[PDB]
Amino acid sequence: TKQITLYTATFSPYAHRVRIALEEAGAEYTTYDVDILRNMPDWFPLVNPLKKIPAMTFGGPEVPPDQPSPESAKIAESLAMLEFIADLFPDAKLLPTDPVLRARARTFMALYENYVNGQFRDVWFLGTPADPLLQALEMLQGALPPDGGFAAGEWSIADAAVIPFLARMFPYLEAGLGLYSKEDGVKMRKAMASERFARIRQYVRDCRARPSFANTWAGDAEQVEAAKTVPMLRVGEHHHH
Amino acid sequence: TKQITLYTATFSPYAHRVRIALEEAGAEYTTYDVDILRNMPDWFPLVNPLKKIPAMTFGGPEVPPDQPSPESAKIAESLAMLEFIADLFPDAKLLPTDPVLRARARTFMALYENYVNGQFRDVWFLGTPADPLLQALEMLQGALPPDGGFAAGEWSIADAAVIPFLARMFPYLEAGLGLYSKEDGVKMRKAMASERFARIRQYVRDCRARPSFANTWAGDAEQVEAAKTVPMLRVGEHHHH
Ligand SMILES: O=C(c1ccccc1)c1ccc(O)c(O)c1
Numbered sequence: 001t002k003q004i005t006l007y008t009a010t011f012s013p014y015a016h017r018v019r020i021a022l023e024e025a026g027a028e029y030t031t032y033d034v035d036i037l038r039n040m041p042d043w044f045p046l047v048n049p050l051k052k053i054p055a056m057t058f059g060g061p062e063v064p065p066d067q068p069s070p071e072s073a074k075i076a077e078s079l080a081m082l083e084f085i086a087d088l089f090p091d092a093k094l095l096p097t098d099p100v101l102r103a104r105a106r107t108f109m110a111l112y113e114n115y116v117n118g119q120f121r122d123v124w125f126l127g128t129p130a131d132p133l134l135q136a137l138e139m140l141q142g143a144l145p146p147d148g149g150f151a152a153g154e155w156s157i158a159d160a161a162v163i164p165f166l167a168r169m170f171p172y173l174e175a176g177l178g179l180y181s182k183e184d185g186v187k188m189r190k191a192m193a194s195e196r197f198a199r200i201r202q203y204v205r206d207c208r209a210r211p212s213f214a215n216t217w218a219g220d221a222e223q224v225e226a227a228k229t230v231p232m233l234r235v236g237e238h239h240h241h
Numbered sequence: 242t243k244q245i246t247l248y249t250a251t252f253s254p255y256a257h258r259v260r261i262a263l264e265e266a267g268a269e270y271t272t273y274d275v276d277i278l279r280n281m282p283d284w285f286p287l288v289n290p291l292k293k294i295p296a297m298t299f300g301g302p303e304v305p306p307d308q309p310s311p312e313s314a315k316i317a318e319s320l321a322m323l324e325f326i327a328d329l330f331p332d333a334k335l336l337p338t339d340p341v342l343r344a345r346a347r348t349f350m351a352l353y354e355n356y357v358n359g360q361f362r363d364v365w366f367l368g369t370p371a372d373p374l375l376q377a378l379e380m381l382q383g384a385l386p387p388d389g390g391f392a393a394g395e396w397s398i399a400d401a402a403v404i405p406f407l408a409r410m411f412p413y414l415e416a417g418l419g420l421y422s423k424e425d426g427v428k429m430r431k432a433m434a435s436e437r438f439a440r441i442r443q444y445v446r447d448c449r450a451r452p453s454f455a456n457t458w459a460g461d462a463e464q465v466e467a468a469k470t471v472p473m474l475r476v477g478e479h480h481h482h
């Protein structure tokens with residue numbers, strides 16, 4: 001019954017992680033867009049002093065999201081939010097109950113954060129070579145149960161953590177979005193279509209097919225347009241070897 | 242009941258986190274050193290295919306650590322391990338029960354991993370400027386309850402996550418260890434002694450005073466020698482501006 005407000009942006013996969021979890025929770029919550037990259041409201045640092053999206057307020061008196069109460073708890077960092085939601089809504093079974101399975105969920109998330117996420121940001125925002133990113137994705141793909149299903153077996157917050165980035169990768173590639181080079185983009189599109197990456201394609205499809213995804217995605221074409229407003233995605237800039 | 246073997250190195254702060262947590266659990270567990278950087282046993286990828294320390298085996302038959310059994314669960318990534326130990330050992334209260342307090346533990350861990358750890362690695366291993374690391378450390382300091390106590394109030398795994406790195410910073414500094422410049426080392430030495438960093442010094446003292454720390458620390462002098470066996474701490478190499 002305590003209110004949940006999530007500060008978001010359509011383009012952001014970090015915000016997207018938490019929307020997905022909140023859906024799978026059957027939670028009652030508010031979203032409120034913030035143009036964090038070009039025109040941050042003056043009050044935002046009151047919900048997140050790091051000036052990053054997502055941000056979350058919890059509890060306090062019901063207020064307009066742009067008039068945040070100093071009495072709500074201010075919760076930062078998307079993976080902290082996913083664990084918080086799981087904690088709040090235990091009947092939703094957002095993590096398994098078995099600790100080894102819970103540890104598969106947690107291990108999967110740290111593999112994404114520590115070895116994959118930095119390669120996405122680097123290939124896309126700096127044009128660094130794609131090969132290490134393909135290697136990190138092959139490594140992450142091997143963590144999945146190879147006969148089907150989600151990271152921990154049943155769906156968990158670990159699948160919320162990773163799908164925003166993977167589901168963005170395909171339509172961004174088809175749209176030539178990113179600073180990497182044409183050579184590397186052909187290389188990425190060929191690899192993500194080859195058999196090497198069949199398992200991960202299944203995983204993207206499986207996650208995409210859940211309502212939590214469909215209800216938090218504006219559409220492939222719409223998301224590409226949202227991503228275009230991202231400065232560092234300097235439209236028509238490419239870096240070479 | 243089921244066995245826990247943790248593959249470690251004295252130098253490694255990531256391994257150190259799991260030792261601290263296992264102590265606070267009152268867990269029965271085995272440690273087995275692995276010279277991961279110079280001479281990795283060729284069985285080691287059976288416990289961790291990423292070839293990193295720490296690695297953990299859980300359950301299966303009692304075997305010698307260097308004859309790991311295919312039937313034990315293989316758990317990777319230190320923060321997944323900390324969450325796993327909290328799960329296994331709930332009477333130990335390694336996390337609070339209140340969700341918002343639990344979210345402060347998780348937020349604190351993400352703040353360290355996302356804004357602080359990369360700056361330690363870069364100042365120390367690449368000689369990059371100290372300033373962003375001091376700024377990140379100031380931000381992390383502000384997340385602490387300023388009146389005293391640990392990240393989430395009571396001690397939690399979030400404190401295991403962070404103290405191996407902070408407790409190393411001070412004696413490594415005094416020992417002139419790292420690739421950063423002399424100027425930068427004087428700068429970090431002064432900054433970490435000034436009143437700006439009073440709170441974090443008390444947090445380091447608070448954490449160090451627990452048995453979990455003392456029983457997992459070889460001694461300041463010993464740990465500095467252990468750190469010297471690290472290639473990327475190539476003694477007598479320094480980078481400037
Ligand atoms: O959307 C992405 C992304 C990048 C590459 C592939 C797929 C998605 C992204 C956006 C903001 C970030 O700060 C970031 O690290 C990543």
Ligand SMILES: O=C(c1ccccc1)c1ccc(O)c(O)c1
Nearest residue numbers: 254361362365406407409410413
């Ligand atoms: O020991 C440290 C360290 C570095 C700087 C200050 C204090 C401790 C370390 C060791 C291996 C790593 O991979 C790493 O990122 C960090």
Ligand SMILES: [Ca+2]
Nearest residue numbers: 142143144146
């Ligand atoms: Ca596998």
